[PDB]
Amino acid sequence: FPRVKNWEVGSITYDTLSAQAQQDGPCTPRRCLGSLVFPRPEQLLSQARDFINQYYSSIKRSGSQAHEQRLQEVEAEVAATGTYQLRESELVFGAKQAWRNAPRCVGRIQWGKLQVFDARDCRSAQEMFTYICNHIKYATNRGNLRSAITVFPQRCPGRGDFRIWNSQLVRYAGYRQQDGSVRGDPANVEITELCIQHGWTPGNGRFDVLPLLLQAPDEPPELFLLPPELVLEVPLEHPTLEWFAALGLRWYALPAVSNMLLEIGGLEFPAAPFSGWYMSTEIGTRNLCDPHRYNILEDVAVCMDLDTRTTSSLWKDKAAVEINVAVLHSYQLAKVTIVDHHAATASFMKHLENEQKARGGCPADWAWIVPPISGSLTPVFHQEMVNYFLSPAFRYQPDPW
Amino acid sequence: KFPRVKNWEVGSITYDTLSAQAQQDGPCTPRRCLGSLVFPAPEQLLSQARDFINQYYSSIKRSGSQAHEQRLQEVEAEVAATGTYQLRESELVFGAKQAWRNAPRCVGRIQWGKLQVFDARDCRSAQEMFTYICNHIKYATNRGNLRSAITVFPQRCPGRGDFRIWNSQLVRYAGYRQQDGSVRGDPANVEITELCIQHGWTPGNGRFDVLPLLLQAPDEPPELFLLPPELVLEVPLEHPTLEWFAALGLRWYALPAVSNMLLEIGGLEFPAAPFSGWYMSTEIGTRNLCDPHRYNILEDVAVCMDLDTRTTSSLWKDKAAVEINVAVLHSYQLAKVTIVDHHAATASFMKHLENEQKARGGCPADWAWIVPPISGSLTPVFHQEMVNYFLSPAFRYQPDPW
Ligand code: HEM
Ligand code: HEM
Ligand SMILES: CCN(C)CCN1CCCc2cc(NC(=N)c3cccs3)ccc21
Numbered sequence A: 001f002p003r004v005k006n007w008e009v010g011s012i013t014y015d016t017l018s019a020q021a022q023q024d025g026p027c028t029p030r031r032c033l034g035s036l037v038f039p040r041p042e043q044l045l046s047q048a049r050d051f052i053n054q055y056y057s058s059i060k061r062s063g064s065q066a067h068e069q070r071l072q073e074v075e076a077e078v079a080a081t082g083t084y085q086l087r088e089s090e091l092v093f094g095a096k097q098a099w100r101n102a103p104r105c106v107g108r109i110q111w112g113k114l115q116v117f118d119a120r121d122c123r124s125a126q127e128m129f130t131y132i133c134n135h136i137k138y139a140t141n142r143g144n145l146r147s148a149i150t151v152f153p154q155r156c157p158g159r160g161d162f163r164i165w166n167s168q169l170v171r172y173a174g175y176r177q178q179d180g181s182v183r184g185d186p187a188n189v190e191i192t193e194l195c196i197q198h199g200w201t202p203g204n205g206r207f208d209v210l211p212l213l214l215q216a217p218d219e220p221p222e223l224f225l226l227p228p229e230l231v232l233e234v235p236l237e238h239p240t241l242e243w244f245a246a247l248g249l250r251w252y253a254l255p256a257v258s259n260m261l262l263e264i265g266g267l268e269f270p271a272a273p274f275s276g277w278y279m280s281t282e283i284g285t286r287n288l289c290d291p292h293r294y295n296i297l298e299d300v301a302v303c304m305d306l307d308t309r310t311t312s313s314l315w316k317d318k319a320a321v322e323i324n325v326a327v328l329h330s331y332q333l334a335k336v337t338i339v340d341h342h343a344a345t346a347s348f349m350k351h352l353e354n355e356q357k358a359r360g361g362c363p364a365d366w367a368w369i370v371p372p373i374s375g376s377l378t379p380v381f382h383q384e385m386v387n388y389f390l391s392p393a394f395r396y397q398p399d400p401w
Numbered sequence B: 001k002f003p004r005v006k007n008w009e010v011g012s013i014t015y016d017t018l019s020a021q022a023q024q025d026g027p028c029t030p031r032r033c034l035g036s037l038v039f040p041a042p043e044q045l046l047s048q049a050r051d052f053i054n055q056y057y058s059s060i061k062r063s064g065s066q067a068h069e070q071r072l073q074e075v076e077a078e079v080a081a082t083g084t085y086q087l088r089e090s091e092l093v094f095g096a097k098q099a100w101r102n103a104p105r106c107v108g109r110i111q112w113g114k115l116q117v118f119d120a121r122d123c124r125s126a127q128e129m130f131t132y133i134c135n136h137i138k139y140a141t142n143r144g145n146l147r148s149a150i151t152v153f154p155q156r157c158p159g160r161g162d163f164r165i166w167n168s169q170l171v172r173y174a175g176y177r178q179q180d181g182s183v184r185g186d187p188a189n190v191e192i193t194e195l196c197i198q199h200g201w202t203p204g205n206g207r208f209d210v211l212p213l214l215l216q217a218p219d220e221p222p223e224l225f226l227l228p229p230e231l232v233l234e235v236p237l238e239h240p241t242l243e244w245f246a247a248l249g250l251r252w253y254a255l256p257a258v259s260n261m262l263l264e265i266g267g268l269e270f271p272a273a274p275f276s277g278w279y280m281s282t283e284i285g286t287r288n289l290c291d292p293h294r295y296n297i298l299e300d301v302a303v304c305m306d307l308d309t310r311t312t313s314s315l316w317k318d319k320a321a322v323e324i325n326v327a328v329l330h331s332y333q334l335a336k337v338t339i340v341d342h343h344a345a346t347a348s349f350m351k352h353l354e355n356e357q358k359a360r361g362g363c364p365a366d367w368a369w370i371v372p373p374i375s376g377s378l379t380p381v382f383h384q385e386m387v388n389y390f391l392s393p394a395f396r397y398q399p400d401p402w
């Protein structure tokens, strides 16, 4: 039972929950691979039993009545068909547990508040688009963002798969050059090349919201233009740097992850987009200041008249902080839900104490919980953490080509 | 079948073949990663020594030669006759550099080849130990132009107790448990402060009181020694544009000299071998001054800056910590004392990673320690995957002598 210390306070806890880890991670006694982003048929019934048992434990209903009974239908269901369907409540309870189990999510204090749009009866690329559109409208909610996941049908053999080709529902274009250099978002240059190579007419500039390459089983994808009134965006301005708005920066309101594979009770949903709301450092520090992203750090520093000629003026640090200040200011003025890295990390500490008394620990990936600016100024920096894989869970999956 | 490692900023990909040589085992399993934890028979002495000698004769391109096999037999024979063996002076110098080279949480390893090794293995008392230590401080400080050095005291050996330095660093500030349960001075040093007093030290009552050295000779109680004030170079902290900052009265010392770690070379153990380089500014500005459990100045600085401290989304914490690091850098440059900022230091660590990949096929690195505690993704190490593992020779932690 791994001993875990908080170095700010001196408190000690043991992670007893770690003892139930499943799909093994990448580390061995001889080397640690915790800093790697992507680390490297009678079985369906075993993962199926375990999830059903997890369900009835939560609802105070282990050992009696329907506990026995639901174990049988999935037995018989896989006996005849080779797979099974989840009760709508299970799909809801599995959805929330997989969020609860995501080691890299700092927002999990919210895990109990989630809206599951059951789209298991989906049947075409036109059906998805409206299911995605109800999601985006429901989650955006005029800027009062609400956590939501939409679950499309569970993959089966013999036929294809529902898969959203974009990493997120809202992404910006990336246009190349004679010199290769990208106008727009360099992270999305690939999916931008597939969107043009499928019908879309490429826009002019930096923040062109990409279309949507949606793919119904077996058939090639179809482009879908997003309603410009459905894509809530926030123009970026700074509370006191008057020229900041003139930089013409923007970001969208809804972070909606549309390529991860949701896995409940052994069933694999390759299309199950979840959305929440942003922590401000994601937009201000990574999206805008990463060297391989919008890479605006130096442009902002010039406007602040900072001394970029020496690293020890800390001009990068100063410009980055104001970029974050502008993100937070802009989202609040637009009345769009956003959380700063200080409040977010402090709620995660509260989440860890919650998870300690409830489940005896919490899987957390320290490198992704600590925010990308001001890490030791947040409490999670001084908190030792244990990282492992529990089920149900979200997983990464190969790109569909 | 070797770990593939990606740099996300540039796209490059390498494989860490050196990790397969990992001479020991860390805390992680396929079940669970514990990488974020701060603290994770002659035959066996023989194979450790054998591996080091192999290493030493590889570095001098005498791999598998006459001298090489001579030394193997010599060591084999001396472990048989005495239970231990003795390092040659050149072996000791090579082993101390390799221990630095191998330290996975050190971001300054671009420097690992430039290390001054003082051989103190003939040391005989606590009083002589004090003289070697004072010479180390004087040489490494060098009036502000810092030089990396290590002084290596007699090795652990059967029949005799250990040489130990009780202090965690050669220069530390006292932490006096005030009567409110609070602390005046550095709270990380309350324990060693209590010990110095208990061992005869007359304590001061300032925030920046330099601790005496508690030096333990084999099978002897520790003995108190005061550092000559003019040996301890300090930097008063001022800010280039915030003139009230000087009125905080903050100081820090020039020489970071870690004195409580164990140096391991070829199975031999040196419980007392203090080493010193120079500071990266974030250690002082972010960790030592702003950690809530250290000097914890962040809020008092933000109030003085007139930041809005009632709400977190004003980023007052971030703004105040950035100005504290600016003051640290400005002050050390003013005083002409070596210091490196986290941008320069992480840039040079990327070059070390590239040197080490051509040289040994990889480099053991602890990502959570290499990425600075502010502005992480603004430095290139943030976007570099890393493989953490233990190679020997090595610096290791060891239990406190008391
Ligand atoms: C409600 C506010 C939320 C906030 C502020 C938040 C914040 C974050 C952040 C900053 C990350 C860092 C990962 C990255 O940037 O690539 C992350 C990871 C993640 N989040 Fe959340 N999140 C929220 C809600 C949710 C919800 C509703 C779900 C799903 C139901 C979710 C699932 C995940 C997953 C799967 C990851 C990646 C975990 C991994 O790769 O191991 N989050 N979150
Ligand atoms: C010359 C400039 C140097 C710089 C800028 C530097 C920088 C650093 C920093 C920032 C850390 C993390 C420590 C912390 O945050 O508490 C560290 C760790 C460390 N450094 Fe260096 N260092 C330097 C020289 C040296 C030398 C000369 C040695 C030994 C001969 C050394 C050995 C170590 C070790 C053993 C650790 C801890 C590694 C571990 O616990 O696994 N460093 N260094
Ligand atoms: C490709 C970029 N990285 C590697 C993965 C993208 N991703 C993976 C899933 C977690 C994640 C979270 C955010 N932000 C959020 N707050 C949320 C998105 C959805 C619910 S909350 C943004 C991106 C990602």
Ligand SMILES: CCN(C)CCN1CCCc2cc(NC(=N)c3cccs3)ccc21
Pocket (backbone or CB within 6 Å): B038, B256, B257, B258, B275, B276, B277, B278, B279, B280, B283
């Ligand atoms: C005990 C507290 N933690 C765990 C480690 C503190 N420590 C010991 C390990 C290395 C270390 C390095 C620095 N800084 C430096 N630049 C140096 C010190 C000596 C040469 S360079 C400061 C403190 C520490």
Ligand SMILES: C[C@H](O)[C@H](O)[C@H]1CNc2nc(N)[nH]c(=O)c2N1
Pocket (backbone or CB within 6 Å): A034, A035, A036, A037, A367, A368, A369, B008, B382, B383, B384, B385, B386
């Ligand atoms: C190499 C390193 O693991 C990589 O840059 C990680 C570090 N931590 C991160 N943390 C979050 N939240 N998001 C990221 O993309 C990353 N990138």
Ligand SMILES: C[C@H](O)[C@H](O)[C@H]1CNc2nc(N)[nH]c(=O)c2N1
Pocket (backbone or CB within 6 Å): A007, A381, A382, A383, A384, A385, B036, B037, B038, B368, B369, B370
């Ligand atoms: C618990 C956590 O691992 C701990 O606070 C670590 C994180 N990274 C660090 N990195 C450095 N360089 N020094 C430290 O003391 C720490 N502390």
Ligand SMILES: [Cl-]
Pocket (backbone or CB within 6 Å): A255, A282, A287
């Ligand atoms: Cl994003």
Ligand SMILES: [Cl-]
Pocket (backbone or CB within 6 Å): B256, B283, B288
């Ligand atoms: Cl220090």
Ligand SMILES: [Gd]
Pocket (backbone or CB within 6 Å): none
């Ligand atoms: Gd101007």
Ligand SMILES: [Gd]
Pocket (backbone or CB within 6 Å): B241, B242, B243
């Ligand atoms: Gd001023």
Ligand SMILES: [Zn+2]
Pocket (backbone or CB within 6 Å): A027, A031, A032, A033, A034, B028, B032, B033, B034, B035
């Ligand atoms: Zn690990």
